[PDB]
Amino acid sequence: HMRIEVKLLPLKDNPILPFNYNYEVYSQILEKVNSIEPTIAKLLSSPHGFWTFSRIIVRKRKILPDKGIEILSDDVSLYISSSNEDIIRAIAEAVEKSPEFKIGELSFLVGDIKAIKVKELGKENVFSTLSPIVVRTVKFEGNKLRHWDLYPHDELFMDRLRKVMILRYSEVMGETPKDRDFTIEVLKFKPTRLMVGSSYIRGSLMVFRYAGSEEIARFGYENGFGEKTGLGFGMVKLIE
Amino acid sequence: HMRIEVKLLPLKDNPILPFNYNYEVYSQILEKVNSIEPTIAKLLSSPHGFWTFSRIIVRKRKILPDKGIEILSDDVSLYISSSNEDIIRAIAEAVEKSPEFKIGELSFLVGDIKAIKVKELGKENVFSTLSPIVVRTVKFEGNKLRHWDLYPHDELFMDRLRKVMILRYSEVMGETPKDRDFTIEVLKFKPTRLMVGSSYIRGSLMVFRYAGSEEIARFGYENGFGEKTGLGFGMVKLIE
RNA sequence: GUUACAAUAAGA
RNA sequence: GUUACAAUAAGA
Numbered sequence: 001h002m003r004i005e006v007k008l009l010p011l012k013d014n015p016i017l018p019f020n021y022n023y024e025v026y027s028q029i030l031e032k033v034n035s036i037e038p039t040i041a042k043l044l045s046s047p048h049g050f051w052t053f054s055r056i057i058v059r060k061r062k063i064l065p066d067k068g069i070e071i072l073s074d075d076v077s078l079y080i081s082s083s084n085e086d087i088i089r090a091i092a093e094a095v096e097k098s099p100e101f102k103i104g105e106l107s108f109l110v111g112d113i114k115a116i117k118v119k120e121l122g123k124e125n126v127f128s129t130l131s132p133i134v135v136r137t138v139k140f141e142g143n144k145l146r147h148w149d150l151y152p153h154d155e156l157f158m159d160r161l162r163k164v165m166i167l168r169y170s171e172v173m174g175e176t177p178k179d180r181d182f183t184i185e186v187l188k189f190k191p192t193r194l195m196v197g198s199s200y201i202r203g204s205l206m207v208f209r210y211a212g213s214e215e216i217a218r219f220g221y222e223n224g225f226g227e228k229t230g231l232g233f234g235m236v237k238l239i240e
Numbered sequence: 241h242m243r244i245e246v247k248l249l250p251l252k253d254n255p256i257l258p259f260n261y262n263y264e265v266y267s268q269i270l271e272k273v274n275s276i277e278p279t280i281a282k283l284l285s286s287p288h289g290f291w292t293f294s295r296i297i298v299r300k301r302k303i304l305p306d307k308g309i310e311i312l313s314d315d316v317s318l319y320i321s322s323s324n325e326d327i328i329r330a331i332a333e334a335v336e337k338s339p340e341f342k343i344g345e346l347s348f349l350v351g352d353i354k355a356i357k358v359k360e361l362g363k364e365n366v367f368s369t370l371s372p373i374v375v376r377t378v379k380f381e382g383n384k385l386r387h388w389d390l391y392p393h394d395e396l397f398m399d400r401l402r403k404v405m406i407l408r409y410s411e412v413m414g415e416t417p418k419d420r421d422f423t424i425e426v427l428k429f430k431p432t433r434l435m436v437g438s439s440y441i442r443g444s445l446m447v448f449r450y451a452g453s454e455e456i457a458r459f460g461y462e463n464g465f466g467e468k469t470g471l472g473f474g475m476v477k478l479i480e
Numbered sequence: 481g482u483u484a485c486a487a488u489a490a491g492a
Numbered sequence: 493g494u495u496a497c498a499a500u501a502a503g504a
Contacts, residue, residue: 063427
């Protein structure tokens with residue numbers, strides 16, 4: 001499966017990355033791809049998770065709780081993934097043509113794009129999250145129905161996630177997977193709250209072990225696990 | 241200040257360290273230090289935190305969620321600290337004369353005890369928790385009286401932590417500290433729940449910046465921050 | 481693709 | 493004693 005690393009260069013001195021970029025990055029890419037491949041842009045913007053992208057990785061940093069993350073590195077990377085290398089292809093082009101990113105007060109400049117080597121999977125895999133995994137349910141709170149976010153320690157999590165993947169899979173892949181059974185067991189777990197647009201989404205940054213269906217595993221690896229993947233959630237990476 | 245690194249060598253075939261070890265380490269040090277020096281043993285047993293020790297540190301490890309932390313290193317390490325170099329000196333002796341330590345299933349053997357080079361503090365410090373930091377208030381749950389454990393997001397957190405350090409300080413240093421003010425801002429934060437004996441204590445694993453009274457700063461640095469430090473809570477290390 | 485493995489979570 | 497910096501936390 002195709003996965004790319006986009007290097008970004010912070011423009012000014014003492015650059016500071018704001019804590020919640022998910023919507024900015026996503027909408028920015030959408031706009032850029034839409035200029036070239038409007039037809040693919042429509043896939044990016046789909047809820048079904050045609051792709052993922054990670055957090056913006058800052059290899060060396062300090063924290064300014066009121067401002068954001070201090071970038072002490074010369075550059076930052078952003079990993080993007082998809083089962084469809086036509087989506088990858090189109091993103092590389094769009095970005096490189098118009099390599100100007102504005103996140104809050106910090107402007108970046110796209111440096112090298114490159115396709116990344118990606119490891120084969122096994123019967124069981126140990127994944128670490130590259131961007132928070134999101135699994136949502138509906139709950140009556142007051143009157144109006146609203147979105148309740150789940151974490152692995154919640155009872156309905158595994159069952160909800162299972163259905164989200166099967167569902168998502170058949171939607172983007174075109175068919176339902178033959179083996180639909182799988183489990184995950186959490187190893188290192190943390191909660192995070194992200195403001196995307198005018199909303200709030202809460203998710204898990206975790207290291208977990210996946211077992212079971214070998215096609216859903218490929219699917220999650222390539223397209224991210226959980227919901228809102230296209231918004232920058234759900235990307236994992238293989239460790240041992 | 242005086243800070244030691246006690247090394248532990250796992251005896252069992254496949255070494256699983258249980259997730260909740262405080263009480264067992266506490267109560268076992270408490271004895272080995274009693275048999276040798278009953279008098280110092282009572283400073284340890286005091287609620288006021290005449291000392292701290294850290295999580296048992298395992299460099300190479302992996303998680304069995306129903307079991308514990310699988311130990312993949314040759315040795316693990318405990319870090320004990322105190323403003324009183326007599327206490328530390330006593331623990332090192334007491335532990336050397338009775339090197340056996342049992343935790344859950346695992347039996348350890350005390351290896352080399354050694355001193356740790358400890359940097360001087362500044363006007364401002366960035367500390368990391370070697371032990372989670374515990375700050376409690378009391379609350380009524382129905383007609384029953386309950387411990388309620390606090391984290392920095394709680395309005396009452398800063399307030400009760402000041403009072404707890406000021407109280408601890410005087411009850412051990414012997415006098416009230418001159419400068420009684422400090423602030424703590426959180427950089428990296430994760431919550432943890434430990435079972436110590438019959439009861440559950442929740443606390444904070446975190447990196448934070450300490451601004452304030454220098455004598456309080458050095459007191460927490462030596463004797464731990466927050467409460468219950470005698471049980472292996474609140475130990476910090478200085479970073480950059 | 482080292483921010484690449486500390487779970488559990490208000491308990492009597 | 494590098495498990496050594498991702499805060500914030502149920503909203504309209």
